[PDB]
Paper text:
The attachment of myristate to the N-terminal glycine of certain proteins is largely a co-translational modification catalyzed by N-myristoyltransferase (NMT), and involved in protein membrane-localization. Using coenzyme A (CoA)-activated lipid, NMT transfers myristate to the substrate protein, after removal of the initiator methionine, in a predominantly co-translational process (Ritzefeld et al., 2017, Schlott et al., 2018). Pathogen NMT is a validated therapeutic target in numerous infectious diseases including malaria. PvNMT possesses 80% sequence identity and 93% similarity to PfNMT and is an excellent platform for structural studies, while to date PfNMT has proven intractable for X-ray crystallography.
Author numbering: 26 to 410
Amino acid sequence: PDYKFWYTQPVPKINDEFNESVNEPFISDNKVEDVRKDEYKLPPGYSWYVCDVKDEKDRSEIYTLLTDNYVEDDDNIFRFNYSAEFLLWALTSPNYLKTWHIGVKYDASNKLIGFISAIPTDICIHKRTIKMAEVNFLCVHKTLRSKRLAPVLIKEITRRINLENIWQAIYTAGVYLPKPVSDARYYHRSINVKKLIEIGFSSLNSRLTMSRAIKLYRVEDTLNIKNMRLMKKKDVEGVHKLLGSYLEQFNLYAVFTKEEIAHWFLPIENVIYTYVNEENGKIKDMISFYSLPSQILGNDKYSTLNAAYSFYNVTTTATFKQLMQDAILLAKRNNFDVFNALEVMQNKSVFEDLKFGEGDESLKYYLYNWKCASFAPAHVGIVLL
Ligand SMILES: C#CCCCCCCCCCCCC(=O)SCCNC(=O)CCNC(=O)[C@H](O)C(C)(C)COP(=O)(O)OP(=O)(O)OC[C@H]1O[C@@H](n2cnc3c(N)ncnc32)[C@H](O)[C@@H]1OP(=O)(O)O
Ligand SMILES: Cc1nn(C)c(C)c1NS(=O)(=O)c1c(Cl)cc(-c2ccnc(N3CCNCC3)c2)cc1Cl
Ligand SMILES: [Cl-]
């Protein structure tokens, strides 16, 4: 590929590799005063729109755009179906900016046909903490693909982020772009076996009959960590200490304030599930996973695959395998069909014994305007939504 757009940007070329001692911007000494004050030009008939995600109607417009036009698997069987409540949660973290929730409307219909978003986060990369933007939910309507709208959305959000004196970003994508700092495969743990077979997500053979498959993935309805319970407001301080200490071992992680811990972990039904083990008023273990269904395209019986995604999990009183076994159980108790995880942090070590199957795609982690050594995904300590 030529990367005609990306090679104009402060990112590594596809052949670039850096020593572990290199950890710095491509372009330093940036000046807010020099940032373009004009919005990037859109093709005739299209206009920028600042979305208010706290307004139900604006939020529903984003929801519809993404439901119909967002990420599909390579075989066009599944399309992500982020809920409206999920989008509210994902986009209104502490110190979010409404003007970083950017839509594009088709003037004649007044309909939203494009979107991109950013939220601010402090990112520790190779022990250096940098104020960054986390870019997500880039989407162009299926009818307008391959018209070079995505670089316009990227350049416009870059401009708006730069106006706030932020010059680095973090982002993930399934597509290969210049140039990942890490690459993490997805793994899947079947919960509702029969449904997964019926929709083609899983397979049988003459050895693995339907009944044998169901027995293989059967789980005992008893927690290894008996007191694991839904997180409450009183647990924010203890989760902040437990998770904050845990994440410092990694090469890439978010540095969460107490306010960010409250936002990202306090439970919201059908959005975010966090469980804690409290001993003597101290949080000693935590499990968390978020809800992200996929629409099943075309299937007669089922419209929705109900998937839980591993978020952040820490144990100090059990083994990591016991903890993730409880995570699977808690997902099953909340009626999820499958439990998905990336090979980040310590996750890969438990996939075999807990009967995860390797998927067929990976998530690439990227930094914008930052050069550093790449690393194996066990050194990644951040999960983006
Ligand atoms: C400081 C501060 C800096 C802030 C900025 C940091 C950089 C942020 C980059 C964006 C990160 C996005 C993270 C994600 O949210 S992930 C989910 C992506 N959402 C989907 O997968 C939904 C379904 N899909 C679509 O909605 C469209 O396919 C897209 C993704 C909008 C792409 O639009 P289309 O019509 O194909 O392509 P056009 O408009 O002709 O643009 C082509 C150029 O674009 C590049 N590109 C494509 N996908 C990308 C992508 N996902 N992220 C970034 N760049 C992408 C591509 O390579 C090429 O450029 P070159 O010529 O190769 O240099
Ligand atoms: C079962 C299923 N349902 N769907 C809808 C799909 C795609 C699958 N197959 S999958 O599990 O193997 C999978 C998964 Cl989960 C995710 C991605 C992917 C692609 C691009 N971008 C992201 N980002 C997520 C983080 N924020 C930025 C966007 C994820 C690709 C694959 Cl292929
Ligand atoms: Cl129990």
